[PDB]
Symmetry: D3
Subunit: 145 residues, 6 copies
């Protein structure tokens, strides 16, 4: 079952047409993996070295290979809660991406950004909503969050 | 007075029976250290190299010694506020523990995790309360928070 | 225009009389730079290696030069939102300053602190307001936030 | 072929009897994977989340699962060149292990230690050879280097 | 004089034709800046946010702008001594690039890699010379070292 | 015995007259602690929060207290071997100090610098000896290495 899930997952990446973690979860559920969830999908994206790429249809999508990869291609997910916008990236890319985001600053609604190895926390200024900040970050990275 | 506090503190660790920072504070107050607080206790746990261990009564407790220590044994405190679950660890162990926590993912209520040297911030998904996340994290680390 | 902005900005630093990012923004607007904002000012403080110093009038102010610099002199801004107190520092100084802040602990209203390269997130305990924590942090660093 | 290599590799881990990267390479070559090398084995140990464990025969060996893991169990390889002893660990464990090693100090032949995410560089004092330091580090971690 | 040096330096970047730090130093000396050296050039590349790009003549060269930048474009210099290959990168990009290099492994002559914020140390295996490793790293990043 | 060693050690710090780890080791040996060594002294400097200060006799010496501390005051030891100059600092100060050192660059004999939490590795260019680099670093930090 696990070998089949890995094969199915990699095939979705090879199609170069899925743009978000939720899309991958839904595709796998439709294939029969009833217990699939975002936690499992996030672990697989990290484990198998998935990155994003702009396909020939101009869509930012996951793919399976990274010296020529761009920072934007290193973003794997953008999500949020009431207080923070959280980005997940490929291993060790969070710091580099956070450097760029914290340069955008308060005028763009970013009060501050802190990154871990593959996770970034973006906190908003009092003048922008977490949802608007979320929408702006999704636009910057072309992620269908 | 400070020499006596250190001696008293180390003795509490040697008893291998205290399970939380608050328990240590209370024990020291009862001994006569009226001005003791969690800030002082946290500094002492860090300074004296305290770690936790499962005692022979099956209780996770502080002890005074660490190549054979486990990640769980490296957690010193778990607490929270309205927006985050915060974990304090032994020096330089936060990154390693955060790697594990962020692998649990959204399906377990963890939207993201970021760590500093000995501090970890865990932010919840919109589908779990900070208190429930707190309770789950306390269960994972067997910490009486 | 950009060359003039840089010259104007550096001159403000050389005056050794401005104590906050907002003061710099206002001074530049008054000089005719209508589009100046905190994002631009934050980038310039980082780019030109600005630090703070206590001037001869006993005021903590920005200056243009750092082996003899103190941690307090490495703080560039202190601001906050509803959930966090955020500090911006000179490049690579956040970790060191965060070490000090997280030692203050819960008894001082600091539940935890995590730092990125030049940004620090301070989360409050349930017993202190974000504004009171903000005011205390501003006092510690003598920053007119 | 790659699916077969992964299956073969995981099976070696499940046997809980291999103690070093070189042993894994040799076992895979004997099975028919003529092009296997340490670079590939190191990538697989990282990718599949391998850790070490003391088996029932008292041997430190690789296994396939980590909250209960010890620092020693997080070491994947110990090797050296003329100037440094280099340790590879599981993801994000290098910092924690380095903290311990740099505490051993000059009296134990360790002039200094610096760690990356999963790599540690140990430089020797002028009073110990890189090979003796290597042998001591291998003994500490019970690694057949 | 400093304002003229900055203007001259930025103009060299805008030409999009210089491939190494030494080339920049030589060009500036020829323009009349007799005291220019690599230390000053390295500081300027960092300060002004220089990155590399493949120009229309297929040459990897410095340019003056970075969300769409690749890891290779983030390398600013490759040099070496008798024991290490050292890479300098744009701010906060060293960790990400090191992750990639340490994946190449021992079979490619890389015993280990450790990174700081914008500096990477690559130590060779006993089977490759520091100069051959240097030459291979220069080829990977297309840097005329 | 350990309580006496701690008391003796702290008293040496309070004298504000010792300038190097070796001086502390020698003073403790003279007091009767026959088994004292640099490993133990380094651990104590870290554990007890020692920093350096310029005393009234203009000597850089250890002291026992740090928001007003300078980067230079955060250096605890400077030593070297055949290939590297290694600096030990107070907890979490290595990154900040390394940022400054790597800005000095190749023209000052510094090929590169990488830091861990409280340790810094400085590798020399082919044009400066490790001993000359050592002597220059000792002069910069006024450390009697």
């Amino acid at each position: 079952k696990q070998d089949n899930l890995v094969r199915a997952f990699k095939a979705l990446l090879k199609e170069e047409r899925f743009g978000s973690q939720g899309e991958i979860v839904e595709a796998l559920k439709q294939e029969g993996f009833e217990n699939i969830n975002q936690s499992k999908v996030s672990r697989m994206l990290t484990k198998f070295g998935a990155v994003r790429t702009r396909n020939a249809k101009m869509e930012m999508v996951y793919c399976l290979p990274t010296v020529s990869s761009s920072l934007r291609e290193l973003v794997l997910d953008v999500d949020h809660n009431q207080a923070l916008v959280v980005i997940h990236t490929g291993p060790g890319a969070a710091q580099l991406i956070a450097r760029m985001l914290d340069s955008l600053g308060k005028s763009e609604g970013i009060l501050g950004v802190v990154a871990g190895d593959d996770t970034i926390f973006i906190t908003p200024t009092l003048t922008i909503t977490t949802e608007q900040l979320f929408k702006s970050v999704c636009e910057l990275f072309e992620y269908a969050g």
